[model samples]
Every structure is written in C-alpha cells, then in structure tokens.
Target: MWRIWQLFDPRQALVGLATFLFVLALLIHFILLSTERFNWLEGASTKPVQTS
Candidate 1:
C-alpha cells in the first residue's frame, strides 16, 4: 500500500457513511417496530400495566 491511486473523495466518504448509518437506523427501527407489534420477546409487552 505504499503507492495508491487517490481516487477517494472525503465528501463522498462522509455522505456514504451518513447514508449507511441512516439505512442501518431505519432497519433497526423497523425491526423494533415489528417486535413491538408482535410479542416476539418474553415480558416485553408494549402495553402499559394497570394497577388498581
């Protein structure tokens, strides 16, 4: 890696990372959303408990 072709752009790098993180965040949000709708995990209900 002594000699390398400088074909990389820092602006695009930041844009690419931002785009990737945005997509990843969206993916995680959807995953959590689906899990919230369906009782996929134990004791993880989305409803609030009622105490009388």
Candidate 2:
C-alpha cells in the first residue's frame, strides 16, 4: 500500500536501521556479560580460589 511505502522512505529507513543495530549491539553485549565464559568486565574466573 502507498501508506506503507511512505514508512520506507530513505531518511526514515536509515534512522530505523541505525536504531535497530544499536539495540541489537546492546542486547548482544548484555547477553555476553551474563555468561561466565564471556564476562569481560570481571576476570575470566567465575569461582573463587585460594592461592598462597
């Protein structure tokens, strides 16, 4: 429909694409942070260890 096509105009399309990518990147980062194997904010170890 003509009305639907308007939503795909170049300027609006670019803005939508940019926002989509930004949110996707944010989701991926949080997903990685939630897993012990990819927790870059903390060290690679997920458990505490005693060393002398």
Candidate 3:
C-alpha cells in the first residue's frame, strides 16, 4: 500500500536486510548441522574417528 511505501527508507531497509540475512544464515547453518553431510561442528564425518 501507499502507507507502507511511506514507511520505507534506505536506513530502515538496510537494517531489515542485515537482520534478515543474519537470521537466514543461522537457519541454514542449523539445517546443515541436522544432516550427516554437513555436520562439521560435531565431527568430521558420519563415523567416529579412532585414536591411539
């Protein structure tokens, strides 16, 4: 609507874009961690590594 357009500005737009990307990155990272292919945080691969 026209009223919504009035509320839009460069400053607010930048802040909103930054926030959106920040949360989006966190969400994607978590989604990756949930699966075996990209679970780097917990371990390197699906199987446990051996040690001496």
Give candidate 2 misplaced runs (Cα > 4 Å). 1-8, 37-45, 50-52
lDDT order, best first, reads: 3, 1, 2
Name the TM-score of candidate 3: 0.39
Predicted structure 1: lDDT: 0.70
Give residue 13's lDDT in candidate 3 (0 to 100).
77
> lDDT, candidate 2, residue 49?
40
Score every model by TM-score: 0.44, 0.43, 0.39
| Cα lDDT, all candidates | 0.70, 0.70, 0.71
What's the ranking of the predictions by TM-score, best on top?
Answer: 1, 2, 3
Query: Tens-digit lDDT track for model 3 on 1-52?
Result: 5556656676687889998999899888877767645465457643467852
lDDT of 2 at 46: 44
Cand. 3 Cα-lDDT: 0.71
